[PDB]
């Protein structure tokens, strides 16, 4: 396995009310910016992922535009949501 | 109370179910939702989640987007709310 332990912890269980910083790739800096834009719980970011029909390009650009995520951060966040959905949705 | 359609939806993961699997979303509403990009039930769940599960704003969005009446929007909200309580 090459994923983070943090990814593995997120994808191992339903997310409930977990904060946005529980997502892989979302450190404290990106998490604060997301919270300031209203994306305060991980499920709100899941919602955007789903409204974009799980499209990697659109979601990763949305994250870049919304909190300044770089390529690795947005890839990690996308992959964590994608695997969570494959497990639970 | 609730329909069997509702109970069937809240009983299991929705996967790739079409938008018409949602309680309240009949033939006409489903067509108008597909026309606007909401072709799968999970895309509507996405909007419910982006709106932070807010009942008034979600039901208003659904009326604005596909013409759902009060019963239809109530049914659709309730099935997404109960699905999330079971699975999210």
Swiss-Prot record, chain B:
Its main location: nucleus. The keyword Cytoplasm applies. Changing residue 5 to E: Complete loss of dsDNA and LEMD3/MAN1 binding. One of its GO terms (molecular function) is identical protein binding. Gene3D superfamilies: Barrier-to-autointegration factor, BAF. Changing residue 25 to A: Reduces histone H1/H3 and LEMD3/MAN1 binding. Fails to promote HIV-1 genome integration. The keyword Phosphoprotein applies. Pfam families: SAM_BAF. The modification Phosphoserine is found at residue 3. Changing residue 11 to T: In NGPS; shows a dramatic reduction in BANF1 protein levels indicating that the mutation impairs protein stability. One of its GO terms (biological process) is negative regulation of cGAS/STING signaling pathway. Residues 19-34 form the HhH domain. Changing residue 81 to E: No effect on histone H1/H3 binding. Keywords: Acetylation, Chromosome, Cytoplasm, Disease variant, DNA-binding, Host-virus interaction, Nucleus, Osteoporosis, Phosphoprotein. GO terms for cellular component: chromatin; condensed chromosome; cytoplasm; cytosol; nuclear envelope; nucleoplasm; nucleus. The modification N-acetylthreonine is found at residue 1. Changing residue 36 to A: No effect on histone H1/H3 binding. It comes from the Eukaryota. Changing residue 53 to A: Reduces LEMD3/MAN1 binding. No effect on histone H1/H3 binding. Changing residue 59 to E: No effect on histone H1/H3 binding. This is Barrier-to-autointegration factor. It comes from Homo sapiens.
């Amino acid at each position: 396995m090459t994923t983070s332990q943090k990814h593995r912890d997120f994808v191992a269980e339903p997310m409930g009310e977990k904060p946005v910083g529980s997502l892989a790739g979302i450190g404290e800096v990106l998490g604060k910016k997301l919270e300031e834009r209203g994306f305060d719980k991980a499920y709100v970011v899941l919602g955007q992922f789903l409204v974009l029909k799980k499209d990697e390009d659109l979601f990763r650009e949305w994250l870049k535009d919304t909190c300044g995520a770089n390529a690795k951060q947005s890839r990690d966040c996308f992959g964590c949501l994608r695997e969570w959905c494959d497990a639970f949705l």
